[PDB]
Symmetry: D2
Subunit: 473 residues, 4 copies
């Protein structure tokens, strides 16, 4: 049971719009909206969305496994050895948000301060003492972007596993010599850094020039969660505010995906006329180039929706019914929809490119969709006894012996393994990950799906407890 | 009663080193060390310090008022009108950490997300509705460093008030015409931005080329808190670890100040031989150029302590007794003292240049000295009934009317005014400031003075409660 | 009769290697090597080449016209109007080295100091007085690369004409409104700058992703000058020095072109065994990325010549027989061939990327191939009476009336038109072009073809008169 | 007899303004204006000047020797060894335009292509073979400004000699160890690069914060050439055009110097009322910050000429009688004087910051003052037999033996030594220097003094022969 299985099971349910059924529904953890900062929904004037993994939720592990296969094939096509063809995607290995160290070829899980929580070289998990040879302070400077790449997106899940596969393969293949910073094959040296860049390039190529989009749209049922409640919630949002889409995807792909997402024999509610997906949006913008979109952006273009090509020149007209935009910036949205920053709730899945940047650069309010949470929640509640025991050991150790330090590592390992080989997205044991820290700081609201907003009344006030400084308590 | 009065009153006390007297002492709020993240003191191997407002705490308002006078005089000497001479420093106006908007000539107090909490044009406090003309979203992008300057240091306190004085003077002087972005005097236009830069330049000039250091060292009793407990605590720290100084100041000034701070007729404890201030440090480094110091730094030089001039060339030797360093980088410290990042507790007062940068770039542990807290604490505890009422109004309003919104602003104003015209350093009403947010995120420990570490035993474990995500609760 | 017709007529001649026949041959202007700085051939140790328009000389106008057609088609395929399909390449319009002003949509011919010599808007030639509206000083700052693009290469000849075609078409098409900086089509504005970038992009696309290389190699006789004397001269050069190729092209294309250039039923001389083109080179380097190649370059890779793909990793071995390199830098050449800068004669056609950069950055000696010179020479000598008259008018006017100024413009126009609508590559009237100035300053030797070196003995000393300063005369 | 002696001897002459006396005067080489590109004086509308070494010509070697002494003293004051005090300026050593190589501590004289002509380490002149260890190609990349500094100005003459002195002193002082890249003194390493920067800093300090200007203005007769013909020529220029000053100096210094230059008991001609120096200029601009001045410049300020301080704010008014400007850009001049680029003759001494930049960035016409030419001309004409013999040997060697190569070096050395140890400013033997090349390319006119324009009638046409390409001859 993957996280997309949870979402697709909740998706197959019809909406019961009785008030009491909703309030009782939204108290169960899986359909809940979680709150980092209070947010008065009645002050929201525009609801905004990206598409990938928000409106269009890609099924797991099928879609990661497709991306992995096509990326492997691209690497082999450019000259990587045939043995790559024998890899097979394994969803139990990668957790999202790991850091790849291009100097030493390691996947790292770190906390908000760059402290190492997990270190794997290939599939070899390096215990604390042995990491100190390469990380004397058990610490990395994350902002050294020449060395470290943070695998922040669900799209990064195939390459997270692929990088470990590659390191494992070359380490154990007798034609190569392992070195501190890469592999030597006689008179060719492949550094982990250049190997890493080939992987990034091949992922980019699969998405832009390869066949991933084509293979997706030819079996959308296999690859995309479909939920009749999506047009219901969008319709309700449009009753109390304006609705816009700002996606990095092109129009042709967006049009195929969105058409599939709205393809029911009815409109918002069963028994109503079907309406095209564009009618649910006051503003549609593609080729957004986020996060640049939240700074100066690019020139505003107009899509010729008949042909799928951009018209020639910069678009200087007003907002019109049926016009589709390309590029521009977040000021385009605010100007054309007459909204100020905090009037906008932006719903996205990119912790950096959607949430952090719209919050910091524009003062937008934010809803982070976290797909894996639909399954992380289930592990969390089923194994609460593990975590409660860890909390209890932490408190006992503090009151103090070394027998307890070993019990702490044992429980920590046993808890993490329930999530995968790389542990929970949000923590390793009692130590929070960087990703968890970013969620709390930049996502005002978050949830496994934004559909969970359907179970809250129109002017609900999401509430979070105020923060007090230690000396204020 | 200023904050330096509180510190100087606690400084005049001799240390009673009975255990029970200490533990009872450190529970009173004013001598307490406050904890954002747990810190096991027994794992600390090096204690590091800056000098200004940490070891050498400048008395308030005397020292701000001196800096203000010399800066005013510098501006008049370069051609600013004589009326500036009639300004007089007023410590009730500035709170530290305000943002000066060079486009519109405003001082702003903002929260961690750039939301406006207070806006003053000169001494005119702009109420919410009127700020929306210049700030349509009640929001600023703080990282736009061309437009916004964050007055983060206590050294910035004179110019915080001076900028408001200048805006007030030119607005109300009939020889000038007020414009959106500055003042017009016939054929000369003075933008708030260029006016602002003249102020920054004049402050820099007073510190580097003017007479501020000279006037300080000629009346150190007037200008510098002196505490016999300082060499006691340094001596105790050196018993369980290494001790270093890394200051941006030059050697000559450091030597005059530090000599004054250690000028008692005794050493660490009364009755012991006096020892020179240098003997309390395993490594002394001046001209540190923080925050660049925590990146690549500058070349390591050696001070000729007899003449106060740098020797010629780059120093390539080892750590020696009596050598004083200049420049270098934080790696110099770690190499010469054989310490790793988390082995170091760095004690400073610059939330950015000392704490944030040493934490993010090097993984150092941090102690932030906040001088004003010695008085903010007293206001906080004396007027807790105001804040408790505000908390109660917040909770009541949430359960819901507009009569309560006005009561909320009334109590908020009345609470803020107890701290000054710009309110508490840490909040305005129930809304936390950017500065408070930075303290919680980057200062592992903080206190009005680092002397408060004297009241904790050698291997004390400072404890902070673990963070849980909303969905983990 | 185009310039490639002249070269192909001289190419069909067999080489007569009698000494007296050579010396008499090389004195005729068309087979001459022209000398800007003296060069002792006996001190040359390596001869180096690029490929395009040096070894592989593309026939004119056929090859420009192919590039024009494919570029037009690419623009139409992305949404430019169908009328573009009715353009047809016209070799009488463009001269190489014109500057396109992206602000005002003009082609400019300028001297070495940026003075305007010719200005055309579309096909409208702007006379002196009318240019002063947009160019008040009849001057452009060429180094303002955001505004001005210098159409330096023969590959730029199709787009030089295309840009004028486009400006002409949009100016005169009633669906558009002409503006100072571009064209308005209701709510779309196409600036000359963005129009210009679409053209650059489409040329790049034709070369890299389009079908230009494919169409070339499927009719090489139509598109490429073929000369049996090429392997003869290369063989002779290899007898007294080392020979290398450094081309920006990829291996697959280089291999097809070079194979065609050496496809005779014999080797260097008739009656000798044919040898593969690679055996004529001590070092073969592709994907050179000049001019970056003459600075830090890119990583050195090794071509798998069987598959045409780069091997995986950085190549760290030595020079081997049969190895083909990719990327690297000019230091690769000098290291692997044991040559110093002035030991190398580099033979290229890019006045900037081959000649200027290798001369300025590395001290290489230079031979600039100028294909058009094979025809410019013929015009020059046939119409010498026009130029001699202009010289005579210049001297007469100086001794002095306005009747002569008009005669000067008349003769200037009549002389320029013999070369094309944009005049001689080297001058307009008595005023030298920027391109001529760059040739004299950076090309030690130059010629219509490098084959002309065949007619000079092994250790010939090319001689140029010494320069004296005005006060030295 | 220095070059300033020649100028001061010609300065003491009264002007005889009979036409025939002038024409006969201007044909003698020393009072001649030399012409690189033809220039019709009647088309000139504005004459512009810098001050230092153009209007105010500093006497030699007195003024270099003062700058040397003050720079030495500054280095000793910051900790350089006392032995520096025993240096004494020696005008026979430096020639202007040498390149200091901060990697290897050498002064280099190079041609226009970076070929080495002379190499001195300290006072040790390195013969050709021995230079190839550090310069394998006898070549430097001049644009590598991190490594090479081009000592282009007469102000650079003191430090040119000082750098050689320093290298000589440290090489031969037993307290130091010579290394490839600097000097080691136990645990201090002084690289030639950091030594070089200390020298640059100390020169800058002497000019801006030291006592050079003060010592100059207290003995102007000793330090500044004074010529009654200067106000005569300025007055004549103002009769046919506009006159402006654009100097990097501040107003106070400019005012002292210019007042001295115009301090005669008469105005333009003897017997006329004296007029203040400002009345000879339509526009006076100080603090010009050339060469930035010819790009975007700095903000336009207004000088308070009573106090010598800048007024407060940006000046936005028009050109007024008596206003003195500060900063701005070259567009300020062109706007306020209504002149286009080629309408301006700019008279300066900085081959880069005055001539090259005004020519390339703005299309100004240029007059380069070269003070040393007043003496280089005398050496040139007195030793023409040496150069004519060298020319004859060059031609003979070309027709060919090694006995002549040695005679060529002998004559080359003997000719160069007549100019100084670093040879002629314009050449070494028959090889032209970089500086000569820049003069020919960027200075339309040049002369030992601009006063030489006095001997040419109002609308003289300076003439230079047209350039022909080798294939055009
Ligand atoms: O790793 C990447 N390389 C290239 N394209 C990506 C990558 N990750 C996501 N995308 C694209 O991003 C688009 C979704 O953007 P969104 O709707 O703004 O979230 C899809 O077109 C993806 O193909
Ligand atoms: O605003 C400023 N301009 C110039 N110098 C400053 C400023 N603020 C602090 N300083 C200097 O910083 C030094 C203290 O550095 P610390 O001991 O590292 O905290 C003193 O020499 C101050 O004069
Ligand atoms: O305008 C251009 N855009 C893209 N490729 C170009 C352009 N001009 C020349 N090339 C390529 O440059 C190569 C020839 O490089 P060369 O042999 O170093 O002179 C060929 O592969 C051309 O396709
Ligand atoms: O090496 C230098 N360092 C600092 N100032 C210089 C240097 N060289 C020239 N100057 C200054 O340049 C000014 C003359 O500028 P000019 O009149 O524009 O040529 C004088 O004030 C000099 O002191």
């Amino acid at each position: 049971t993957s996280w997309s299985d949870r979402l697709q099971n909740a998706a197959d349910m019809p909406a019961n719009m009785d008030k009491h059924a909703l309030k009782k529904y939204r108290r169960e953890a899986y359909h809940r909206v979680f709150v980092n900062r209070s947010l008065a929904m009645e002050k929201i004037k525009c609801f905004g969305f990206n598409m990938d993994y928000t409106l269009a939720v890609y099924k797991s592990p099928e879609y990661e496994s497709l991306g992995f296969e096509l990326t492997v094939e691209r690497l082999v096509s450019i000259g990587y050895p045939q043995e790559l063809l024998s890899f097979a995607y394994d969803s139990t290995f990668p957790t999202r948000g790991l850091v790849f160290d291009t100097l030493y070829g390691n996947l790292l899980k770190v906390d908000a301060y760059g402290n190492l929580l997990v270190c794997a070289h290939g599939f070899n998990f390096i215990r604390g003492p042995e990491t100190r040879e390469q990380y004397p302070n058990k610490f990395i400077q994350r902002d050294d972007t020449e060395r470290f790449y943070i695998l922040n997106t669900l799209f990064n899940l195939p390459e997270t596993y692929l990088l470990a596969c590659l390191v494992d393969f070359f380490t154990n293949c007798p034609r190569y010599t392992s070195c501190e910073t890469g592999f030597k094959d006689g008179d060719l040296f492949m550094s982990y850094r250049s190997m890493f860049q080939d992987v990034r390039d091949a992922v980019d190529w699969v998405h832009y020039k390869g066949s991933l989009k084509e293979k997706t749209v030819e079996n959308l049922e296999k690859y995309v969660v479909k939920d009749g409640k999506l047009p219901l919630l969008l319709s309700r949002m449009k009753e109390v505010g304006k609705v816009f889409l700002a996606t990095n995807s092109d129009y042709k792909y967006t049009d195929k995906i969105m058409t599939y997402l709205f393809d029911f024999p009815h409109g918002p509610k069963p028994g109503s006329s079907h309406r095209p997906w564009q009618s649910y949006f006051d503003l549609i913008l593609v080729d957004a180039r986020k996060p640049l979109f939240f700074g100066e952006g690019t020139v505003l273009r107009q899509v010729d929706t008949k042909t799928g090509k951009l018209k020639i020149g910069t678009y200087t007209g007003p907002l019109q019914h049926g016009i589709v935009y390309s590029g521009g910036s977040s000021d385009t949205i605010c100007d054309l929809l007459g909204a100020k920053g905090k009037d906008i709730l932006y719903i996205g899945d990119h912790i950096f490119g959607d949430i952090l940047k719209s919050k910091k650069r524009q003062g937008w309010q934010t809803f982070l969709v976290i797909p894996e949470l639909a399954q992380e929640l289930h592990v969390w509640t089923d194994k609460s006894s593990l975590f409660e025991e860890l909390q209890s050991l932490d408190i006992f150790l503090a009151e103090l012996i070394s027998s307890i330090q070993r019990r702490i590592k044992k429980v920590t390992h046993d808890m993490d393994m329930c999530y995968g080989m790389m542990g929970s997205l949000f923590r390793s044991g009692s130590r929070q990950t960087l990703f968890a820290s970013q969620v709390m700081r930049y996502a005002d609201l978050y949830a496994a799906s934004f559909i969970n907003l359907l179970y809250y009344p129109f002017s609900y006030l999401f509430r979070a407890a105020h923060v007090l400084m230690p000396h204020e308590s």
